[PDB]
Design an enzyme around this catalytic site. Structure first.
Site, short mmCIF file in Angstrom:
data_model
loop_
_atom_site.label_atom_id
_atom_site.label_comp_id
_atom_site.label_asym_id
_atom_site.label_seq_id
_atom_site.Cartn_x
_atom_site.Cartn_y
_atom_site.Cartn_z
N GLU A 190 28.98 7.72 58.07
CA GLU A 190 29.66 6.65 57.34
C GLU A 190 29.90 7.12 55.92
O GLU A 190 28.96 7.47 55.21
CB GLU A 190 28.80 5.39 57.27
CG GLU A 190 28.91 4.46 58.44
CD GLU A 190 28.12 3.19 58.23
OE1 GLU A 190 28.13 2.32 59.13
OE2 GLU A 190 27.48 3.06 57.17
N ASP A 223 26.43 -5.24 49.29
CA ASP A 223 25.39 -4.22 49.45
C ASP A 223 24.09 -4.49 48.74
O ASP A 223 24.01 -5.31 47.83
CB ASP A 223 25.90 -2.86 48.97
CG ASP A 223 26.99 -2.31 49.84
OD1 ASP A 223 28.17 -2.48 49.47
OD2 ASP A 223 26.67 -1.73 50.91
#
Length: 244
Positions: free
Chosen positions: A36, A47
């Protein structure tokens, strides 16, 4: 998109520089079932603390959108490992969906994950990704209900990505519950980003049905500290997480 039991590394493009990101990928490829690559964004509100800081570092050092493609392109000369570009919608939208996806594909990207894709643009996006040959990767969190998991699984052509903002140093019960619910609903494979940081985390998640385990924060924390010299320390962390 990956083999079962895969460990999937997550890295932020341009943290601290695009060249170092490439070095990290090459050093980790041998352990990766897939990778990723994150595109830094000014407001990565989805996040955890660690990854948000890596986005800030990347942008400070002047990361430019297409430098991400540079990283993928170069990596491609040495590897065929599946690559999923992770990003917020804003950059895509500002550059033009099809344009971005097309440029992603051309560089070697296989799948894309839009962290905060507005449901309103879901359909349009999936159609274009398909037309451009990019597989879709959708995200779900502990507060995603079964009904939506199903809608997510039916739109997914890459794999379902399960996350937990909880942190830990144990994997929260609510993360495991999400995994348990997903496996009972998803035909697509599923990868988990529960902030693993210990060998038992990986061993446990795979035993509970996770087709793949992402390893992001644990690696980013080392990059925030070690900088360009993160490589060697990364290789050891992954080795530890893989029991080797």
């Amino acid at each position: 998109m990956f083999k079962d039991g895969s460990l999937i590394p997550y890295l932020t493009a341009g943290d601290p520089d695009k060249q170092s990101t490439l070095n990290f990928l090459l050093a980790l490829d041998e352990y990766a079932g897939a990778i990723e690559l994150g595109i830094p964004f000014s407001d990565p509100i989805a996040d955890g603390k660690t990854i948000q800081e890596s986005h800030y570092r990347a942008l400070k050092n002047g990361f430019k959108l297409r430098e991400a493609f540079w990283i993928v392109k170069e990596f491609r000369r040495h590897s065929s490992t599946p690559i999923v570009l992770m990003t917020y919608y804003n950059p895509i939208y500002r550059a033009g969906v099809r344009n971005f996806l097309a440029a992603a594909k051309a560089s070697g990207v296989d799948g894309i994950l839009v962290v905060d894709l507005p449901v309103f643009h879901a359909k349009e996006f999936t159609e274009i990704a398909r037309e451009e040959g990019i597989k879709t990767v959708f995200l779900a969190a502990p507060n995603t209900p079964d009904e939506r998991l199903k809608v997510i699984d039916d739109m997914t052509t890459g794999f379902v990505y399960l996350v937990s903002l909880y942190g830990t140093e144990e994997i929260p019960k609510t993360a495991y519950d999400l995994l348990r619910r997903a496996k009972r609903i998803c035909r697509n494979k599923v990868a988990v980003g529960f902030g693993v940081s210990k060998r038992e985390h990986v061993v446990s998640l795979l035993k509970e049905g996770a087709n793949g385990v992402v390893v992001g924060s644990a690696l980013v924390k080392i990059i925030g500290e070690k900088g360009r010299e993160a490589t060697e320390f990364l290789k050891k962390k992954v080795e530890e997480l893989l029991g080797i």
